[PDB]
C-alpha cells in the first residue's frame, strides 16, 4: 500500500461521502460530519482490494488473516475507512487472480508494517523455501473474484485514511476559511479546529 503523503492542501471531506466508489464507511476518533471544520497535520492514505467478508478485520487493533498476515491497523487509529463494491473492475468470470492474500506466515504483524517476502513458510516439519507441496503451502493465495459471488465474497476496493490529531503545524484543513484578527478584546476565537473564548 503506497503511503501517499497528503499535506499542504484543503481537503473537502464532504465530497467523499456521496457516490458509488465511496459508499460504505466506518470512522474512529473523529466524527466524519465535523471533518469539514477540523484540521490535521498529515494524513496518510492507502488503496487496496480485499474480499468483503475480510473487511471486518479492517479495524483498530483487531486480528484475523489480513490483519496478522497483510496489514495491521494501530489500536489508537483516528481515521476513516472507505470501501467500494468493485465487481466490475476486479472480478472476472471463473475467477480474477490479480490480487494475492496471505493465509500463513512465520510472524505476527505490527501496525503499518510492510513485507513483500514471498518465501514459502514451513507449515510442518518438512523443509520449505523452495520446496512446494504438503507442509509447504503457498504464501500468496488469491480469492478468485467473480461477479456472480454473494456480497461477502465480492472484491472490495477499500481506502484507508489515517488522521493525525497531533498539535503540530497542521497543513491539511477543511473547506472552511479564516477571518480577521482582533486583539485586546473579549472575543470568540477558533484556531485550526480549536474553539475557545478569551481575550
Amino acid at each position: 500500500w503506497n503511503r501517499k503523503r497528503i499535506s499542504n492542501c484543503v481537503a473537502d471531506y464532504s465530497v467523499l461521502y456521496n457516490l458509488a466508489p465511496f459508499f460504505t464507511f466506518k470512522c474512529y476518533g473523529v466524527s466524519p460530519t465535523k471533518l469539514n471544520d477540523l484540521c490535521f497535520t498529515n494524513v496518510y492514505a492507502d488503496s487496496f482490494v480485499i474480499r468483503g467478508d475480510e473487511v471486518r478485520q479492517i479495524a483498530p487493533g483487531q486480528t484475523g488473516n489480513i490483519a496478522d498476515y497483510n496489514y495491521k491497523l494501530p489500536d489508537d487509529f483516528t481515521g476513516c475507512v472507505i470501501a467500494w463494491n468493485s465487481n466490475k473492475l476486479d472480478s472476472k468470470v471463473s475467477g480474477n487472480y490479480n490480487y494475492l492474500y496471505r493465509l500463513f506466515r512465520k510472524s505476527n504483524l505490527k501496525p503499518f508494517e510492510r513485507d513483500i517476502s514471498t518465501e514459502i513458510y514451513q507449515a510442518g516439519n518438512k523443509p520449505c523455501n523452495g520446496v512446494a507441496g504438503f507442509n509447504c503451502y503457498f504464501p500468496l493465495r488469491s480469492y478468485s473474484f467473480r461477479p456472480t459471488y454473494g456480497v461477502g465474497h465480492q472484491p472490495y476496493r477499500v481506502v484507508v485514511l489515517s488522521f493525525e490529531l497531533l498539535h503540530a503545524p497542521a497543513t491539511v484543513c477543511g473547506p472552511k476559511k479564516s477571518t480577521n484578527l482582533v486583539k485586546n478584546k473579549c472575543v470568540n476565537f477558533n484556531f485550526n479546529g480549536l474553539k475557545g473564548t478569551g481575550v
Binding site: 503511503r3 496518510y44 494501530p74 505490527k110 501496525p111 503499518f112 508494517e113 510492510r114 513485507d115
Partner: protein
Amino acid sequence: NCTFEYVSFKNLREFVFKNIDGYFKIYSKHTPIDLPQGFSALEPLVDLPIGINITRFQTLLALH
C-alpha cells in the same frame, strides 16, 4: 527499490533514533566543545512512517 527518498575534538553532534508505530522519529543536537559532562535536550527533527522492521544498524565513514 527506493519506496521513499528525501533530500534536504572541536564539535559534538548528538542523535537519537527510535521506532514507534512504524514512524521513524529522529532527534538531533549540535554543540562545540569520552562524553563531556553536561546537559542538553535533543529536539525533534524528522518523523517518517516507513514501517520497516529494523533490528541492526551500522554507521558510515568517509573515503576520498
